[PDB]
Design an enzyme around this catalytic site. Structure first.
Site, short mmCIF file in Angstrom:
data_model
loop_
_atom_site.label_atom_id
_atom_site.label_comp_id
_atom_site.label_asym_id
_atom_site.label_seq_id
_atom_site.Cartn_x
_atom_site.Cartn_y
_atom_site.Cartn_z
N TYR A 312 0.87 -1.20 0.00
CA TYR A 312 0.00 0.00 0.00
C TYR A 312 0.90 1.24 0.00
CZ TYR A 312 -4.11 -2.90 1.29
OH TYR A 312 -5.09 -3.83 1.29
N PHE A 315 2.19 1.61 -3.41
CA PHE A 315 0.98 2.00 -4.19
C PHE A 315 0.78 3.51 -4.14
CE2 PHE A 315 -1.61 -2.20 -4.03
CZ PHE A 315 -0.61 -2.81 -4.78
N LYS A 321 -1.00 8.69 -10.91
CA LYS A 321 -2.22 7.84 -10.79
C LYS A 321 -3.32 8.65 -10.07
CE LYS A 321 -2.67 3.26 -9.05
NZ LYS A 321 -3.52 2.19 -8.46
N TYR A 322 -2.99 9.22 -8.91
CA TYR A 322 -3.98 9.81 -8.00
C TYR A 322 -4.37 11.18 -8.53
CZ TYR A 322 -3.08 5.54 -5.66
OH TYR A 322 -2.89 4.21 -5.41
N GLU A 380 -13.67 -1.83 2.07
CA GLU A 380 -12.39 -2.57 2.02
C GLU A 380 -12.51 -3.90 2.78
OE1 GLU A 380 -8.90 -2.22 0.39
OE2 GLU A 380 -9.45 -4.18 1.16
N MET A 408 -16.81 -5.97 -1.53
CA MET A 408 -17.86 -5.19 -2.27
C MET A 408 -18.98 -6.10 -2.82
SD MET A 408 -15.67 -4.02 -5.57
CE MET A 408 -14.12 -3.87 -4.68
N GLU A 423 -9.79 0.95 -8.09
CA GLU A 423 -8.33 1.00 -8.38
C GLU A 423 -7.83 -0.48 -8.41
OE1 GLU A 423 -4.86 3.20 -5.82
OE2 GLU A 423 -6.73 2.87 -4.71
N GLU A 432 -6.29 -8.66 -11.89
CA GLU A 432 -6.62 -8.69 -10.44
C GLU A 432 -8.13 -8.83 -10.28
OE1 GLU A 432 -4.50 -5.49 -8.31
OE2 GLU A 432 -2.56 -6.18 -9.20
N1 LIG Z 1 -1.21 -3.90 -9.59
C1 LIG Z 1 -1.67 -2.98 -8.71
N2 LIG Z 1 -2.82 -3.22 -8.12
C2 LIG Z 1 -3.29 -2.28 -7.23
C3 LIG Z 1 -4.51 -2.54 -6.59
C4 LIG Z 1 -5.03 -1.64 -5.69
C5 LIG Z 1 -6.31 -1.95 -4.97
C6 LIG Z 1 -6.03 -2.92 -3.83
C7 LIG Z 1 -7.15 -3.05 -2.79
C8 LIG Z 1 -8.48 -3.51 -3.39
C9 LIG Z 1 -9.11 -4.45 -2.37
N3 LIG Z 1 -10.08 -5.38 -2.95
C10 LIG Z 1 -9.82 -6.27 -3.95
C11 LIG Z 1 -10.92 -7.02 -4.19
C12 LIG Z 1 -11.93 -6.58 -3.28
C13 LIG Z 1 -13.27 -6.91 -3.01
N4 LIG Z 1 -13.94 -7.86 -3.66
N5 LIG Z 1 -13.92 -6.24 -2.04
C14 LIG Z 1 -13.25 -5.29 -1.39
N6 LIG Z 1 -11.99 -4.88 -1.54
C15 LIG Z 1 -11.37 -5.56 -2.52
C16 LIG Z 1 -7.89 -5.15 -1.78
O1 LIG Z 1 -8.20 -5.79 -0.55
C17 LIG Z 1 -6.84 -4.04 -1.67
O2 LIG Z 1 -6.82 -3.33 -0.44
C18 LIG Z 1 -4.32 -0.45 -5.41
C19 LIG Z 1 -3.14 -0.18 -6.02
C20 LIG Z 1 -2.60 -1.09 -6.94
C21 LIG Z 1 -1.39 -0.86 -7.60
C22 LIG Z 1 -0.94 -1.79 -8.48
BR1 LIG Z 1 0.73 -1.50 -9.31
#
Ligand SMILES: Nc1nc2cc(CC[C@H]3C[C@@H](n4ccc5c(N)ncnc54)[C@H](O)[C@@H]3O)ccc2cc1Br
Length: 625
Positions: A312, A315, A321-322, A380, A408, A423, A432
């Site tokens: 994170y 990230f 990005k933001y 989340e 979600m 995101e 993902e």
């Molecule tokens: N390849 C990358 N992927 C990214 C994904 C993210 C998002 C990550 C988060 C999303 C959360 N997540 C995933 C599936 C999901 C779900 N079904 N419900 C709630 N939260 C969810 C999940 O738990 C998490 O906190 C942010 C930055 C990124 C940068 C890169 Br580079």
């Protein structure tokens, strides 16, 4: 920061030469380990019994000096591939003797020539050495850009040079190396020492060599032009090449005599120094990525896995990005809430996958700079991230933001949402499972709501890199399929490689998904026109996304969002490399498959020849729902 050796064929005293060479600025010395004229008999009496010591003592230098400063060279009379049986056999014994002596000394590397087309026995004997005792010398295969037969001065009356262009013949020294390395089974320990000559060839020939394991480039003194002050320099076209090799952080070897016999010799090296620091500094992407060049990582899977605090943190170290996301909610709030409605209308924003809050703060900034009002939900599933949110919410946001600790797809929602911001995008956009996640949350979008992002597209492109092929080959593990490592994607800052054809769109997804009987599975066929002879090792993957209207993100190299280092490309290897001739079309087939537990990719080359289907049924690689 530019690593450089001297080539010599003549070392009266190893002691004094090394000191001469250090004093010139050189980091290391390529020398003979036996006298290059001391031919040896192994079979016929009386020469086989030649008395005396066969070479100099190991005691002439410190162990440390052997291990760092010395690169050995094969005696030039050793010809394992001669037509004369007797030379084939002495040279066999000669070579194992020289190679074994290099081992005794612990030389970091030993140089062997590819100076002809048939190096079969030379591979066989090197392959034998490699499987005898434990050693780990690197083997530098000295191979020229241009066969010396192809830069001979045109001065044999009854043997004219070829004044016609042979596209494939001008690449013969690449096939010398290709055959050698294929026979030695792509050993990680066999690399290229690439000899640059006075005339470069056509770019097609130089390009053959990108993606190849180049550890050294050899510059003879005889290719340097002289400047007015009298000092050695290189053509503008030789400079272009040096600038490319400094990107491959290769080592530069200076061979041959001083031909600038007024101006001293460290002059040659100094000019390399002058080019090193006269190149463009690293951009932010390049400073973020120095470390990562051709490093294979597993694709992150933030659904199936809870991500570490420090992930994170990387990230959220992406200002582009933001700021791109902020600007997209800004533009969406203005298009949704006319001016005269500015206080009557509070919009419902639901960040799906809030992580540690960056899209919340990007949503709170946008709503300010548009002057509109918003109800934030921060949904989340990673409870460790929810600890970050619930604290950064008591202390900072208000009431404004309600943190939801849920998947979600599971959440019953108090209200429907005017906007959903996510995101969930991978290096291959959908890898993902953005599609499956946002599909499950679509029911709490208002019948006229926006998703940011609104659309994303994966792209693919065939690549050549015997470097990355070798790297994937090395990921064999205990206790799984011996070939699984070829049936799974890696994220990797592809560096030592050759994009063989322009990217092309693969799989596309839109949010919301208007038309029902949804199906997020897919089959796609791509036809890549290829303009060079080459070898296919896998497919680079990239994506583009439409957040809102004209606000977009790209890791497609030709449209790359400048500054934005969050995502490196993805790579889809193939088990077996595939020769491609100039003019031939590479035909690749991608499937996106799913059951209710797993999503995965399967993939195939159907032209010019077929691969096996990679990853049938996710047997090697799946993404958890
Ligand atoms: N390849 C990358 N992927 C990214 C994904 C993210 C998002 C990550 C988060 C999303 C959360 N997540 C995933 C599936 C999901 C779900 N079904 N419900 C709630 N939260 C969810 C999940 O738990 C998490 O906190 C942010 C930055 C990124 C940068 C890169 Br580079």
């Amino acid at each position: 920061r530019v690593s450089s050796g001297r080539d010599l064929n003549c070392v009266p005293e190893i002691a004094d030469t090394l000191g001469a060479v250090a004093k010139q600025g050189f980091d290391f010395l390529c020398m003979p380990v036996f006298h290059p004229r001391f031919k040896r008999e192994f079979i016929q009496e009386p020469a086989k019994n030649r008395p005396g010591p066969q070479t100099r003592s190991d005691l002439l230098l410190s162990g440390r000096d052997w291990n760092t400063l010395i690169v050995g060279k094969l005696s030039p009379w050793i010809r394992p591939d001669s037509k004369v049986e007797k030379i084939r056999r002495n040279s066999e014994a000669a070579m194992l003797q020289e190679l074994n002596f290099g081992a005794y000394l612990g030389l970091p590397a030993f140089l062997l020539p590819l100076n002809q087309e048939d190096n079969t026995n030379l591979a066989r004997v090197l392959t034998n050495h490699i499987h005898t005792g434990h050693h780990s010398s690197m083997f530098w295969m000295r191979v020229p850009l241009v066969a010396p037969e192809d830069l001979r001065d045109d001065i044999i009356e009854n043997a004219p040079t070829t004044h016609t262009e042979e596209y494939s013949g001008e690449e013969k020294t690449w096939m010398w190396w290709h055959n050698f390395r294929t026979l030695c089974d792509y050993s990680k320990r066999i690399a290229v020492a690439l000899e640059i000559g006075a005339d470069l060839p056509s770019n097609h020939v130089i390009d053959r060599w990108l993606g190849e394991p180049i550890k050294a480039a050899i510059l003879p003194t005889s290719i340097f032009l002289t400047n007015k002050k009298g000092f050695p320099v290189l053509s503008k076209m030789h400079q272009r090449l040096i600038f490319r090799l400094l990107k491959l952080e290769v080592q530069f070897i200076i061979t041959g005599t001083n031909h600038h016999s007024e101006k001293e010799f460290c002059s040659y090296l100094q000019y390399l120094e002058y080019l090193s620091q006269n190149r463009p500094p690293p951009n932010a992407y390049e400073l973020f990525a120095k470390g990562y060049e051709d490093y294979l990582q597993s694709p992150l899977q933030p659904l199936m896995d809870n991500l570490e605090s420090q992930t994170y943190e990387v990230f959220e170290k992406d200002p582009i990005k933001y700021s791109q996301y902020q600007q997209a909610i800004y533009k969406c709030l203005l298009d949704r809430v006319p001016e005269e409605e500015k206080d009557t209308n509070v919009q419902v924003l639901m960040v799906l996958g809030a992580g540690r809050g960056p899209l919340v703060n990007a949503s709170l900034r946008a709503a300010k700079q548009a002057d509109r009002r918003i109800k934030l939900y921060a949904v989340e599933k990673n409870p460790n991230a929810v600890v970050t949110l619930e604290n950064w919410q008591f202390e900072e946001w208000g009431s404004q933001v309600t943190v939801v600790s849920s998947d979600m797809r599971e959440w019953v929602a108090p209200e429907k949402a005017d906007i959903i911001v996510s995101e969930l995008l991978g290096s291959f956009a959908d890898n993902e499972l953005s599609p499956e996640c946002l599909d499950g949350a679509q029911h709490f979008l208002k019948d006229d709501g926006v998703s940011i992002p609104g659309e994303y597209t994966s792209f693919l492109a065939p690549i050549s890199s015997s470097k990355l092929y070798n790297e994937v080959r090395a990921c064999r593990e205990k206790d799984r399929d011996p070939e699984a490592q070829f049936e799974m994607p890696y994220v990797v800052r592809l560096h030592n490689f050759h994009q063989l054809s322009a990217p092309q769109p693969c799989f596309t997804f839109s949010h919301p998904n208007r038309d029902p009987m949804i199906d997020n599975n897919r089959y796609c066929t791509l036809e890549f026109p290829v303009e060079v002879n080459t070898v296919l090792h896998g497919f680079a993957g990239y994506f583009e996304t439409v957040l809102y209207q004209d606000i977009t993100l790209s890791i497609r190299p030709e449209t790359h969002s400048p500054g934005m280092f969050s995502w490196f490309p993805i790579l889809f290897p193939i088990k077996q490399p595939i020769t491609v001739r100039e003019g031939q079309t590479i035909c690749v087939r991608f499937w996106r498959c799913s059951n209710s537990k797993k999503v995965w990719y399967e993939w195939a080359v159907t032209a010019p020849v077929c691969s096996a289907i990679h990853n049938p049924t996710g047997r090697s690689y799946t993404i958890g729902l």
